[PDB]
Symmetry: C3
Subunit: 533 residues, 3 copies
């Protein structure tokens, strides 16, 4: 096989040029398709052109930043030195301008909107103050991350809620997801037949979870998830001044669950501080995963609000963690180590899809079994309470009544009016004790009742609430913070870092509370910007 | 934070008094509720008052026994010395009185009831004699546990079957369970829809198993299960003279499965004797779990009889184990070590509920798959036997016919009349080979046919049997002794105690046989007391 | 217990004779039943007599071969020496006779049948040549196994397709399986109710997989599977000259999956060569399992063709593996070590049934989830392609069109006519990317459309194809070679042999390609013998 040996030698000699030429040819073919499509019709081919343009821009930008990093840093250094020189007097001016802007915004927008928005602002202040009072180290507090996180949340809310561009962008993004979750119906129909709608939840909702997990694993294989995670983490790190590890984990928990997000930085867990570990757990508790998003949307919960809350939950999580448990040590991990994220052991895209599909079995199984047990326990508890309540001629006693009269202040501070606060408190209880699959399920019923348009009150019982309250509840409930999740979180984090078991158990409860508080802060910011119809 | 430090110091200084005061306040509130309810109406608040009274009595009793144990023992010692002094001649008197009582009971009750009850007594004697003949060490037999276990079974049967108080108590207890298993319908309806009754077994029965496992895990977390287990084990230990480990395991297997019951004494397994290990396996094989109770009740099997059999199966298991495999070594474990039972790694009640729910996935999955395979094999076997039977112009040959003509003597000795013995033998075969989920399922069909009231015989084929036979079959079938369970039992017990693998394999078959024999003994005792309608 | 000791001593003294006498009595009883059945009626009892006769013949043959092996070998040796002496000139005569026979068969059968059969022969030649060109070691090729495997495939095809005896035998064998898979309906009906047909796939097809896995585990416990495996492996080893390990694995993969077949030789995996490992993987990729056979038959795929393809896939796998990756080392394992296969840890038949049933849970779960994900991805891909295709006024672009225009040459070489090649290419794509559960599912639709008898063309779209194309597709698609299976195969084989991880990853892709090529070779041989209706 002399010819075969010569061919192998030729391939070895110019391996780099051959593959580069092949990739260039593929790129040229794609560009030819795009340009031909634009030529035949432009209005019809606009989205493809836009996608290609943005991809090209990002590729060029990344290449330039990687290549000319040192030159750009050197060019920026003089301005940084001048700003540091004049900061001792410029800080007061900047702070005064920001405070004046806050005051003007309040006076000219929030007061016009009404009283409930001012109550939302007051609730924000009150939650922050309460977190400060019960802090682990109240004296050793670094206030930069707190203010920066709250400001980032406010800016995101302004751009997405009070501007036509962001509103349109996020509505479109939500609509695309709603279309995307409809593809699982093919597999559900084949496996479970054309009668798969006889059992809506089991045979139509869970397949959405399966499909979303598959797609997420495929995206992780390709590397887009890590790209977006790094882009967001750099912003949060530069503005807020947090450590790279916690910033990366917070940015990744927007898309990934609390248990699987620490895997982004597996090797460096034994060397993190207590504060970073607490921030990791808090970020896990203050966000949801992309797999369960489709189920919540199927129930009827707004997609745009869910995405907005997931985005806003990260700065709030980091700020609340830093205030609740500030840093009193020296971090060891550096930016390059944190940003590098080890992709999985998948040889090709289809293997990644299979791996993602297989992992979803336990998820759906546990979801179903826990729902069964929780609802059975709820029924038993309500029956027992009615039995006890009949002694005092009050057989209407129930879990819902107690929770409505208990969690009312937390909902009132978020800006919910007096009447609907008692209804939001029930959802808060459902989430606090059982989980968020139940709270969103009841919220969907309330939304459907409003959409139907029946009587708001029947026999003096409120049947549904307003749009603003529904949005505020959507923001408040977006989290994984329940008493049950504490054990599984601790177990997983110990399994990843056996040596840090003593530290993990110490901060888990504070992390859970901080996650709940962060959800409430996001809800308050939402409420102070939405208007009363 | 000087104020915070002062508050922390104050909390540390008087930590004990603060929590004690809080608990006292909670207790006072509960008592205030109880007394107010009684004041408003007494007949309506009676059960709450009774529950509170019994709880108070048991708490006070436990405190007194723990505090004044030494004084009570010293006070009792003189009487024990006197009894030991006079025992050498008093033993004959006591034994003669007991024998005379047995004879009088036989003559004046059993003969009046009829012949079948005398046959039941004879079957009891015969099973005991057969266990003696095939004993591992016939010469080294300690007869105290045998007689004491049989006597405890007889006393329990008298109190629960032949007295209005016990009959009413256990009927009420059974009715409460039937009400309790109806709460799972809420979760089943949500997860599987309002059409969940289209698939009765899968979508209504298994959720009962899930809910019961959840409740059992919660009770184990609270500590009531261990309380009852210790109370029963002390009685069995004092009366029968067995070792603490086997007594505890037998008392715990009333509520817990054979695989999970040894976990009550995990550390001490390597140090147990062969006899104690055999007793453990026998107790596992002679009882059922509380999770599968609801399914059997849903089929239509009597709850009171199931509870009575589960209670009676422990003394029989221990007696049959001691007779089959008596003790020839010195036990090492002591009472304090055995009674202490390590609760699980659950931080709160809801985490315990989640853990219990998750563990139930494998249980129901295996139940369903094994049922599918066993019924398919049964159909294939029956078709093949009919094919073989057609050669001799007898195409009616089947598994049921062979089992009816094979297991008939075992059912006849239990007191089942001649006609119904052939029908009970089929259930015995179903249980011996496949499992008890099948035997109870067929028994439920027979019971339903009787309740309908159709012809007892159609074309010379008996369609149903009497009430007494159904009760005797309920007692006989209450066990986990099947040829399949041998492997899983051995695997689990080796996984708990790897070093004792050689001993575990040796006694497993004898334990299985002893469990079957114990079930039959319970059935014989039931039969000799029930009357022929 | 002196009598017991005497009985035990007597049993120990003559243990061998007692059990032998018992087995002889059982055999005599069985023979008495057989003879009585024949006496009462012979035509009715014929199959039982035939089964008994063949069993007796095989038992006697095995005993004689085991006992008189040395004498038979010595008797055969002289002829072997004479043949070796005259081989140097007799080889040319034998080869010329074989070539002349091939030429005559072509001229007088294949040409008469038509052009497509000649195209099938040419495709066979072309696939072999392509495997030779891209071989790992083209110079170091041992041609005996290649020709012998192709010849064995041709002989099997002649006996099973072009002779009434083999045709009848395999049709009968297929019909028995179709009857056998109907027994699972009992378990499916009980567990999932009389409405289990509302969800055909989930509640009727997967139980077939469960039941077949149970039966396979039972057969492995009994030892028939190993008997047949050894019988086939000896033939393949003697004729082809392959190593015992790869021959055994290839013979066992007819009935067993790719992951579980290497367990037949677990200990010797670390000591195999690279070529044997490659052959193992190739055999795994070129065959199916007996558990999934029932599902394919339920869809509507021919049973006889499936069995024939499974039988023919082993010689092709070995030949293609030897040509693609020939042997350049010295094998270490010997025949006695390879043939001995360690049965599982099952004490009795029912325990084996339970073990087989439990293992089937993961199989069906993964099947269902992967199907859901794959079909959802297919729908999304088709929608996206239609969106892209509308730019050029061609909204009909799809995965199916691309695959039809891509895989067409591979189907044309197999002998499929011009029109149906584009349809077979779609099935090839479905199998190559997703899996064979999808390709057979679509093939069943095509077969059903033909059976209905509607218009072959509607609006210029072909709705179904011919019988010959359906058979060729049945042969082509019988394999587990998909891009997804690469990862699971590698993981399992590394878990069995951790030390050989470097070698396993190297040959997996070549093994996958070789499996596909072997399937195509079987299809070509099928096509060159079937006639055009
Ligand atoms: C409208 C809705 C949301 C709007 C969000 C807008 C948020 C922007 C609001 C305000 C921006 C201006 C804040 C400047 C405060 C100084 C922070 C600082 O670094 O010094 C710290 C004093 O830190 C303090 O104790 C000050 C706390 C009270 C300040 C309230 C104003 C001490 O030094 P440090 O520990 O090194 O830090
Ligand atoms: C418009 C509607 C109403 C108003 C909304 C306002 C929304 C404002 C949203 C976000 C701005 C929040 C700024 C919080 C500053 C914290 C103070 C601190 O110590 O960090 C300082 C950073 O240096 C700065 O001062 C950052 C200035 C950012 C200016 C953004 C425009 C110094 O950092 P350090 O040396 O590490 O200590
Ligand atoms: C509910 C959400 C309420 C959010 C709204 C408001 C909460 C405001 C902050 C107060 C949080 C408690 C401070 C704290 O760290 O204690 C922790 C809670 O300790 C507990 O076990 C109580 C949990 C219930 C907390 C509800 C109040 C114990 O700290 P650790 O033992 O060091 O760990
Ligand atoms: C009505 C339905 C059920 C009623 C149950 C009522 C059960 C109460 C029935 C009978 C209570 C009286 C039994 C007393 C028997 C002596 C046992 C003893 O300890 O000595 C043993 C003799 O053990 C024997 O060999 C005696 C066996 C035959 C006795 C049959 C009576 C030898 O000493 P040990 O080994 O140290 O013991
Ligand atoms: C009423 C209807 C019909 C009759 C039913 C009767 C139901 C009776 C039910 C239970 C009583 C069964 C007693 C069995 C005694 C076994 C003999 C033995 O060796 O143990 C002895 C215990 O010492 C005793 O004798 C125990 C006496 C208990 C008296 C209960 C009243 C000595 O123990 P040891 O020194 O360790 O040897
Ligand atoms: C009808 C459908 C299917 C029919 C299948 C029928 C198959 C029977 C067809 C043909 C049987 C005759 C084949 C004899 C070829 C010699 C093989 C041999 O051992 O020597 C090798 C030459 O090997 C070669 O290079 C020869 C390759 C070309 C031969 C084509 C004929 C070299 O020695 P080796 O490496 O030690 O080997
Ligand atoms: C009938 C319809 C049309 C024709 C179909 C023909 C179907 C033929 C099907 C199978 C026969 C295929 C024979 C392939 C022989 C390979 C050549 C080789 O080197 O091995 C040789 C074996 O020695 C042989 O030659 C084997 C002879 C077998 C004769 C079978 C009748 C020598 O082995 P080595 O010393 O190890 O080197
Ligand atoms: C965290 C949860 F307990 C949730 O509370 C429950 C309700 O969604 O499901 C669990 N869950 C969900 C998604 C995920 O990715 N990981 C995970 O553990
Ligand atoms: C022991 C069993 F094989 C039973 O025979 C079968 C039928 O109930 O289910 C198994 N089983 C049931 C309850 C339990 O707690 N543990 C357990 O293993
Ligand atoms: C190999 C497979 F990926 C198949 O491609 C898929 C479609 O049948 O199921 C998997 N499978 C099937 C049978 C078996 O025995 N083992 C196994 O892994
Ligand atoms: Na998350
Ligand atoms: Na038990
Ligand atoms: Na196979």
């Amino acid at each position: 096989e002399r010819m075969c040996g010569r061919m192998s030698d030729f391939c070895r000699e110019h391996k780099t040029t051959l593959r580069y030429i092949i990739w260039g040819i593929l790129i040229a073919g794609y560009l030819a398709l795009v340009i031909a499509a634009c030529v035949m019709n432009f209005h019809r081919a606009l989205p493809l052109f836009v996608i290609t343009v943005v991809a090209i821009f990002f590729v060029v930008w990344d290449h330039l930043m990687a290549k000319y990093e040192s030159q750009i840093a050197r060019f920026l250094s003089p301005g940084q030195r001048l700003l540091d020189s004049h900061w001792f007097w410029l800080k007061w001016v900047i702070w005064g301008c920001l405070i004046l802007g806050v005051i003007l915004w309040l006076v000219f927008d929030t007061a016009k909107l009404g009283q409930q928005q001012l109550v939302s602002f007051g609730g924000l202040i009150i939650y922050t103050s309460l977190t400060f009072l019960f802090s682990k180290h109240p004296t050793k507090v670094y206030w930069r991350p707190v203010f920066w996180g709250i400001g980032l949340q406010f800016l995101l809310g302004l751009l997405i809620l009070r501007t036509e561009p962001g509103f349109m962008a996020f509505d479109w993004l939500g609509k695309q997801v709603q279309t995307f979750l409809g593809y699982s119906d093919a597999g559900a129909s084949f496996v479970f037949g054309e009668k798969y709608t006889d059992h809506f939840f089991a045979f139509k909702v869970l397949p959405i979870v399966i499909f979303f997990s598959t797609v997420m694993s495929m995206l992780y294989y390709l590397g887009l998830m890590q790209w977006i995670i790094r882009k967001v983490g750099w912003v949060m790190l530069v503005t807020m001044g947090t450590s790279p590890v916690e910033s990366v984990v917070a940015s990744g928990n927007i898309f990934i669950g609390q248990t699987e997000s620490p895997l982004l930085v597996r090797p460096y867990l034994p060397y993190v501080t207590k504060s970073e570990l607490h921030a990791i757990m808090t970020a896990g508790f203050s966000t949801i995963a992309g797999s369960v998003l489709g189920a919540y949307i199927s129930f009827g919960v707004s997609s745009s609000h869910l995405l907005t809350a997931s985005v806003m939950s990260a700065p709030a999580a980091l700020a609340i963690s830093k205030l609740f448990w500030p840093e009193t040590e020296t971090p060891k991990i550096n930016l390059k180590n944190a940003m590098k994220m080890e992709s999985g052991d998948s040889r090709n895209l289809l293997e990644a899809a299979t791996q993602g599909a297989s992992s979803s079995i336990s998820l759906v199984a546990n979801i179903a079994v826990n729902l069964i047990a929780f609802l059975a326990l709820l029924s038993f508890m309500n029956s027992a309470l009615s039995w006890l309540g009949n002694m005092f001629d009050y057989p209407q006693l129930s879990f819902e009544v107690i929770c409505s009269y208990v969690f009312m202040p937390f909902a009132f501070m978020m800006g919910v009016d007096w009447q609907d606060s008692f209804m939001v408190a029930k959802l808060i209880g459902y989430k606090t004790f059982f989980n968020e699959f139940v709270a969103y399920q009841q919220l969907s019923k309330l939304i459907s009742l409003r959409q139907v348009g029946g009587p708001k009150f029947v026999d003096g019982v409120q049947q549904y609430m307003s749009m603003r309250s529904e949005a505020i509840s959507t923001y408040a409930l977006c989290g994984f913070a329940n008493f049950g999740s504490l054990g599984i979180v601790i177990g997983g984090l110990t399994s990843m870092a056996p040596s840090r078991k003593r530290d993990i158990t110490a901060g888990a409860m504070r992390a859970l509370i901080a996650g709940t508080i962060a959800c409430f802060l996001t809800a308050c910011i939402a409420g102070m910007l939405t208007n009363t119809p």
